[model samples]
Target chain A: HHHHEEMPFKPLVTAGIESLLNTFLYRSPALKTARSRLLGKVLRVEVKGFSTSLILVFSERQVDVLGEWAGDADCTVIAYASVLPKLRDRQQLTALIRSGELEVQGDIQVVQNFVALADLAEFDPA
Target chain B: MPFKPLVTAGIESLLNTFLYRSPALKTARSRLLGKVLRVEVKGFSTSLILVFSERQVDVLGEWAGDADCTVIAYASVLPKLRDRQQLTALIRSGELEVQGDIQVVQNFVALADLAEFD
Candidate 1:
């Protein structure tokens, strides 16, 4: 019903998310409007407590999901790497954090940022 | 009243803007060329029909026969929808009625790009 980007089979790659995000920004006004709400914030997502993390820089007009953390992170989340798919389905990361299986800090409210990301890129949810 | 005359006129304005602003819709409009999409207001006497073809979209008054798809709704919902209210809210009001080919309406709506103006 909504738009969505073309995704790859499991193990969601870093390059893949960046490519999908760029393409999605063009198609979804839902996503574009959300980007406006997240004017100047940053977040780094570390999978399984890895040294390298995925950094997301939210500027007024654009979003950059950087592969490695090259800049400061306003917030950071350490969780099981498979969380991307769950987020796409409207799931929140709070469950894992409450279970003590995750570690997240810095402007925790950034979770709200992800809430606005609507999956509108032509998907067949079977 | 099923719909206010002004609200019905507002919906017409939205569609008029949509058709004028997007070349993509016009190029795709050729597909509906000569076909008709009609809207019927519950208490309104005149039905609205749109004919797309021959490089133009013709807005006509009531017709005698069937159309490709007909959306029957009260006037209150038209302005709400153009204002970008969720379809769910409009449906929940119990005034929005739709019939005829599902895909026809979907394809017709797909031709509209209200996102371009925003």
Candidate 2:
């Protein structure tokens, strides 16, 4: 049997995120400006309950969603899956950070840009 | 552990969702209706049996014993399977080893090609 020591479902989650992001981008062309602004930066998202992380590499064309990223990220956001939806709002975002529901490290601007881009999609992370 | 089951479920979800969103691939899935393809990735202990139906494709952790075709390929080659021209070339180059009905392999390639992201 193959080794089971590795974290499970990384590939699945990676594929799902990649598909959803691309599909949503395909549906909303207006979001391209925000996406393009994110080029050459990498953002890491860590979901606590899921015990998984995603490394998103932004390019001019699209975002490269990766599960097994070894490279460093410009920003890392650590939050529970349930709190993910709250990140879409600026007001709630500050509250979540202040109340300890979310913790962010590295460049805050990158995180803000990511949230802004996702907000443009108009989909609830909830 | 239950890693195998999770992986299979993920595969099924990924494939089905991709097919559902793509109008062409949704209809192209019928070409694989009632056909099963067993995929054994090189150097991996896990095996995937893809069962196709009218609406969706199901991924099984184990073979159900009635595979129309079995494809032995490397993990790196999977993304390329979505390309029909590349599929034929790989078969000739010996990178993709196929057994049983070759037509099934062809149809699977077409469906994969259509399922590719925008």
Candidate 3:
């Protein structure tokens, strides 16, 4: 069996995603049916020197992990680990966007739609 | 003393388990990693340009744009999560003001909700 110490530090990232998923589950009505129909897709995020790469896959009902990747993927996100905590604060997202610390690519419309589905003030632990 | 390295490592170990290293986390990382946005720290009075993608997120250091939203906060505010509450207070008190689209600023609430403390 895997001991707690033996586990990786990926929980932080998972926790963050779960927070978003909860909001999506709550807000998106279309997602209710899509949850079962659509398979979870993989998303790759890189923080340069911090960790190399992180992979995320999700469906309407649940999210799954496929481990870290070494190359590009269907979607890619980049940012600094240091800024994560601040980003976690809902009140800060807009300010950060105006100031210019966060950035994105790939499916912009999808991401924005997802953002619309999220409730920044709500908190959850997975 | 020189033994501080072990203490630091131990601290990292504790944070690693309760923090990152979960299945759901990858989704959150992917969402912000490659996307581009401007970052503003009110307390530190600093700003930066960032680009995020599937493989990695990069900091452009600084740039100019008609930002969709601007995040403001002090350096100290980051370390203590409560600082976010301060930002809300500032906004209510008119100490903090957000320019540009209100929808963009409103998204922060959803983003914050996505993060997990436990």
Best by TM-score: 2
Runs in model 2 deviating more than 4 A are: A1-126, B1-3, B23-26
Candidate 2 to truth, TM: 0.51
**Best model per lDDT:** 2
Docking class of 1: incorrect
Q: On a 0 to 100 scale, what is the lDDT of residue B94 in model 3?
A: 54
lDDT of 1: 0.55
> If both were scored by TM-score, which would come out higher, candidate 1 or candidate 2?
2
- Summarize candidate 1's per-residue lDDT along B1-118 as a digit string, tens digits: 2333333444444454445444544555555666778877564566887666654455666466678877777644453333233554555666666677644554555454242332
**Highest-scoring model, DockQ:** 3
Off by over 4 Å in 1: A1-15, A49-51, A88-91, A119-126, B1-118
**C-alpha lDDT (0 to 100) for residue A21 of candidate 1:** 54
Give a tens-digit lDDT track for model 1, residues A1-126. Answer: 022222221123344455455555534554556566556888787766244567877765557776666667888877754454455423455665576555778876675565445443324121
| DockQ values, each candidate | 0.01, 0.04, 0.04
TM-score, per-candidate, Cα-based? 0.38, 0.51, 0.35
Cα lDDT for residue B27, candidate 1: 59
Give one clash count per candidate, in the order shown: 10, 0, 73
Residue A103, model 1, lDDT:
70
lDDT of 2 by residue, A16-123 (tens): 677667665534667768777678999898866444578888876677898767878899988765576467666677788899888899988887777777787765
Q: Model 3: residues >4 Å from true position, as ranges?
A: A1-40, A70-72, A82-100, A120-126, B1-118
lDDT string for model 2 (B1-118, tens) is: 2336545776788776655444555567777889988888775666799888876788988763878999997655676676787787999999899998998889988766655542
Question: Which digits, one per residue and each the tens of the lDDT, describe model 3 over residues A33-114?
Answer: 4344224556665653443355656565565544465655555656565555555444565565567665555754333333
